[PDB]
From Swiss-Prot, chain A:
Mediates the endocytosis of glycoproteins by macrophages. Binds both sulfated and non-sulfated polysaccharide chains. It is found in: Endosome membrane; Cell membrane. (Microbial infection) Interacts with Dengue virus. It comes from Homo sapiens (Human). Residues 10-127 form the C-type lectin domain. This is Macrophage mannose receptor 1. The C-type lectin domains, also called carbohydrate-recognition domains or CRDs, 1-3 have at most very weak affinity for carbohydrates. C-type lectin domain 4 shows the highest affinity binding and has multispecificity for a variety of monosaccharides. At least 3 C-type lectin domains (4, 5, and 7) are required for high affinity binding and endocytosis of multivalent glycoconjugates. It comes from the Eukaryota. Disulfide bonds join 1-12, 33-126, 102-118.
Length: 129, 143
């Protein structure tokens, strides 16, 4: 793995929790990780989770929340029929997009996930190959 | 296929991209500071390894009215360790330097700067000097 990046025993993870003043939104966090050649960290098994936890330990970043690459995201007819026709007014539909939800990691031994407004300022975790 | 970052002059035939930094007289830096700045971006002070790369930079100069300005390049005098000779210039064969010697000769004093006119010529000057500067980055890479 790159310059000190949690080595999955596969994937490399790196925490980013410098200060509460430079926390980013999910989108910014994702741009930051992508500009590095990777992306926001994805957790696909217990192993990957232990790794991030060791990183949290090794750095003393207990209890901090981190953005993970978790993201959520059309209209259907109730009766089941297919949407073979549309007559939306200009710009419609549009409400189903004023808010989006993303998943954050609770940095304690439970290592649990919670979804929240993708616009919250948070620490984040990247993953490079 | 590697491509150049958010608008940086791309060397059509190589893997380098260039960007001018001429924010004005009160923004100028030293070779080392300029180097720190460029590497901080994930790049480095610009190297000119051929004519095409030189032309890419000249086109950057033109597109920004940066005519007649001076820019730092990654050009730096390295002080080859084979440089010592005797008083008449004869080469040194036998040697009896103390432990760790020689070593004062390694002090970095001279760096290269680019004259932003059509000549695109280089001049070696004291690295302490304040100049505008140019960075380069590898394609496929983002600042
Ligand atoms: Ca809850
Ligand atoms: Ca929730
Ligand atoms: Ca000179």
């Amino acid at each position: 793995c790159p310059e000190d990046w949690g080595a999955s025993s596969s994937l490399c993870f790196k925490l980013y929790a410098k200060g509460k003043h430079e926390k980013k939104t999910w989108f910014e966090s994702r741009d930051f990780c992508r500009a590095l050649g990777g992306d926001l960290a994805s957790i696909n098994n217990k192993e990957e989770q232990q790794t991030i936890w060791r990183l949290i330990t090794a750095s003393g970043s207990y209890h901090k929340l981190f953005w993970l690459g978790l993201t959520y995201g059309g209209f259907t007819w109730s009766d089941g029929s297919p949407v073979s026709y549309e007559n939306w007014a200009y710009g419609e539909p549009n409400n189903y997009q004023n808010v989006e939800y993303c998943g954050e990691l609770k940095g304690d031994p439970t290592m649990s996930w919670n979804d929240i407004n993708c616009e919250h300022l948070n620490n984040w975790i990247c993953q490079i190959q």
